[PDB]
Design a protein around this ligand. Sequence first.
Ligand SMILES: Nc1ncnc2c1ncn2[C@@H]1O[C@H](COP(=O)(O)OP(=O)(O)O)[C@@H](O)[C@H]1O
Ligand code: BEF
Lengths: 52, 58, 409, 765
Amino acid sequence: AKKTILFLLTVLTTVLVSGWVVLGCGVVILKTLHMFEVPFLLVDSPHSYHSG
Amino acid sequence: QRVTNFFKEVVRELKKVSWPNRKELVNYTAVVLATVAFFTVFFAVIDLGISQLIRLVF
Amino acid sequence: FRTISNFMRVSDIRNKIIFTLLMLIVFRIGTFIPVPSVNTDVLKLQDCGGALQNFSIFAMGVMPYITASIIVQLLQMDVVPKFAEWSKQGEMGRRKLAQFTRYFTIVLGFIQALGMSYGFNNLAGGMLIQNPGIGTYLLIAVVLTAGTAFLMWLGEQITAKGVGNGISIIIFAGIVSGIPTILNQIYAQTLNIVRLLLVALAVVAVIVGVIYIQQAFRKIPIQYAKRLEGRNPVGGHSTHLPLKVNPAGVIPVIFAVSFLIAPPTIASFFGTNDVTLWIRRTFDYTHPVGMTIYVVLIIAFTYFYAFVQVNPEQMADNLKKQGGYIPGIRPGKNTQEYVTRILYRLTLVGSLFLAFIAVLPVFFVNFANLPPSAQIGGTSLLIVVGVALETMKQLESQLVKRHYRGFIK
Amino acid sequence: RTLNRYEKIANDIDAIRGDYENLSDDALKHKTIEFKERLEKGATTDDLLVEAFAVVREASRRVTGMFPFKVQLMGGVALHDGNIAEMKTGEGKTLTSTLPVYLNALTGKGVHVVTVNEYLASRDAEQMGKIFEFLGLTVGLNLNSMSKDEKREAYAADITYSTNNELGFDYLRDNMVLYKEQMVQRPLHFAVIDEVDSILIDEARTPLIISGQAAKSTKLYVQANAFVRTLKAEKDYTYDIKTKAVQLTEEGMTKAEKAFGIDNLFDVKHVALNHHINQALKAHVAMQKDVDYVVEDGQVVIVDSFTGRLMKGRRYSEGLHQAIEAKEGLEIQNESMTLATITFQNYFRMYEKLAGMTGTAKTEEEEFRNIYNMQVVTIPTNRPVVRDDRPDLIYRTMEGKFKAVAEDVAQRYMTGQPVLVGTVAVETSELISKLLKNKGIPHQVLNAKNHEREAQIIEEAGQKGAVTIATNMAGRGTDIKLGEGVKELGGLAVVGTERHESRRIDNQLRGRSGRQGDPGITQFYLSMEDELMRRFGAERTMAMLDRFGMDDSTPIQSKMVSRAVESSQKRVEGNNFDSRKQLLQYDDVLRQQREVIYKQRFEVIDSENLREIVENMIKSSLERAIAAYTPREELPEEWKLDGLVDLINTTYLDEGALEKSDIFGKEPDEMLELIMDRIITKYNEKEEQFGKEQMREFEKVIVLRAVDSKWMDHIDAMDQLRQGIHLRAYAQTNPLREYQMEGFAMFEHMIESIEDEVAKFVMKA
Ligand SMILES: Nc1ncnc2c1ncn2[C@@H]1O[C@H](COP(=O)(O)OP(=O)(O)O)[C@@H](O)[C@H]1O
Ligand code: BEF
């Protein structure tokens, strides 16, 4: 099933956002803060009066 | 050999893509560089003025 | 120019570009407004520190809203079935999902405000929040989530009454506001004139490459056999289904940096060791083993996200569901496998372009000795190019609304 | 607040009524004369408002015996301001369309009173025309069966009663005339709209299309009929019932390829055969015989979706009407071809002041405010509504519902109370009619096919012991007046039979029961295998409907199925909302283009000398032919001017007048002046030769024929673009911006084609 993969991706993303707890010394965390953009939002009978 | 067949298919597929022409490429690059230059100058002026005002109010 | 004067000459377009600049000024006064109860610290003295991120209201930016949107979009795909029915029901479900993103991003802005506050405290070594306690940390967490709430309301304001999409304009404003300090460091470095000219010509060359790949559509022809198509054809603007060369966007890099920097975060959550030091040396992407695993993760997540966003099976069932078909291809499963093959080849090219863009600035800092806070062309370059072009196209569509001529004149 | 202003004006009208009562007749027609004099002299229509409303009240009594109440005066003042008077159904919304119609009919510009169908238009026109023709104004009534001279004499009256379809079609046929004195309509001034929700909200989902007939095809309709008739309902096609959409399957596509001798049905060579198999499939299984058409004297007559009446001129488009005509062995007629097109939004938004009154508008205040900038004013009721309004009764099967509704009207017939059963189809009404023939109950039925006896059915439907079955016909304006001794026993039990596509439509049926303080009982009988529940009910509840059991003698008592019913109806409301909104913005694009062309076509109709129009067309086509050769990126003396001399001699200057030495590589302006001077001397020779007046009729015919043919082709090209548009949302853009940009490019190519055709037809003939 692909459900596990989707869940794993979500958990990893959450860990990345909330794993800002040790900042080294961060050489990636501030980059992560400024470098991403929003995703793009996901994707009868006609009549006709014949006269002229 | 499936991989070289696949890369031949990839180059054929790249032929079928409708790439922008030269005129649209130079117009778009002018728009991008002009917008970055204007907003860079605008935000520098904004930062200098607001920082000087904040320093004037202390 | 001519088209810029055309923008100024019309009153409606000039009204909304002036409204956009006013709300960007309103956003930019907030980067100096500090968080209360933090102010008595070394933040007035830190000039090992932050130095780029610094601090302020809107320290979150709109990044809680980005994370909320990408998480609920991955949950729509058969993970919470309630969201799948809300997506399949229509526009009332779209309002339900938008309100869910608003409450999800208030939740997420809260917990990331906790995380970032304690993390900047630990980066500062503790001595950045006087009286480190539960009440003050909850106060600054509600303050940062209020910052994100004001920025999202500001984005909705500037997308209702200003130029383009609001959240993209605010993200673009954060990037290009970061630019002039980098220009200041580049100048205060100077180490010749030929280094600046070669790196600036390479910057404009990679801007042209990003314009070239971002604005390229493979246009599948689609034939609707539900209308006559009788005796009024020209043949220019036939119906098609455009797929981009880079369908995934830039979200492959968020999944790649997550999967790259989560094991150093886990290993530092544990503490210093020998295998911890090997992990922290290995998973740094300024090094060739770390850069190889970064590039492989970018390619894998570009394939995963291009098949999430395009979804060949759902678009083939969506094409069978209302008439249309590709000419030659029987509209059930064969349409799905045709557009899947197109997607495999196109995503190979787009993923390689994304991987070359995302590791470009470490090559520029090494081979061109820039100050390492530059990052001249990461995914900030892709956000900058995308937002500039779609704001220009929205303004152009308002102009062509105002140009209806007539045969009499 | 705005309500207290209307109460203060209603009290002012009562105060003036104190003096207005003792005036004799022939001293009130002089009051209309005095109002026209005062309105010409210096006054507006607001001041006269107070006086004018009092006059109408007195006139109303003397003509009809009905005095307006105070809430009818509040409705008149709210309709005069351009608002929407929401007065409840039964509270006299026909005298409040007499007060501001009289006030805004005095200047002479003309008032159009729109209704939903022609029974209500004729019904209101007779009575209110008695009131208005008392006071010295004219009343015209514009119907579908009138010739253009009678329609021109109807719109030349001071007050016109028409339906919304006839107003739209007279507008679209006014912009297909060849003379200025063939147009029927006056310039549009003031529309009062009875039942605004039905006209501006409900049936503004659909456009008005006028189409002339192209050449006939008959072979492929009969071939696709004879194929689709033998096609095995579950194995070779799937009828999606949520949206009524029929597609073939892989066995069906294989049988279609092996029955026609083709190899691939989905080529680009067989788009015509695939279109015919699709439309024969839809006409066979997705359209049933008495539900949404009929057969009437060898013709297929479509039954209107909203009013339930026979639309005897309208025909299904994209080749579906010929597939229905071939389904039943009737004669197949010629294929149509769209000439003109408008929406009810963009037609009722060119009216300079637009009012309206209705009974059920408070749900749609945001839609009346966004699109039309009209605000719903809710007006009190003069007498409290004592209509007993019972909840639904959900059953498990359709036959259980119909046995229960027959038993209910049988127990209500026994006490003499009038019943009005209300269905939506022409076959469920005859199903319940044959359920009431046996059990022995004398009834009447008002189908789409029983339109001729409608007044004699509605006049008898409130008498002691009269049972009426009625479709959508008697559900929007029908005024059933109660008989003698019938108010005392709870008059006019209305019995519904299904839930409609909105709450307003069934609130209108209950409104037929109520009728201004007289008692009444409504009751809706529902099923779980209805059409609304089968199409739009959520997939979760069906397990619980299996759980509930099967005896169907008693209804379901639970809140689960009631939640399912209300959720399905709200989903239909949301779907209709979105379809209405996207039709609105796409016809906003086509509205800008249509306004440009209709304005300039009208100013080449009534132009006394259109020499300068034709000369600007020739000059614009000439400069485009100059710049289409001689490309300005290219350096001169390479410009291949020989093809330019050939094109100009073929198109403008009679094959001998231009040779290459006259131009010889100039800058384009001076050679453009040379070719333009040779064109203008050839044209002035033709003008002094042909005659000053015959030349204008000649080039008027040329200009109008070019505009009309290229605009028809542009309407059809914009419809094909509107199909492909959502597929353009796959590549992450929004498709409306693509539609606007492609529509602007396509419009300008059309207008360049018009100018080229007019230039070559005037200068080479
Ligand atoms: N001032 C009045 N006095 C007595 N009866 C009235 C008065 N105004 C209206 N009515 C009656 O109320 C009934 C309501 O019918 P109608 O006007 O069709 O309702 P609506 O205004 O809801 O369409 C009419 O039969 C009319 O005779
Ligand atoms: F406009 Be009514 F209720 F006949």
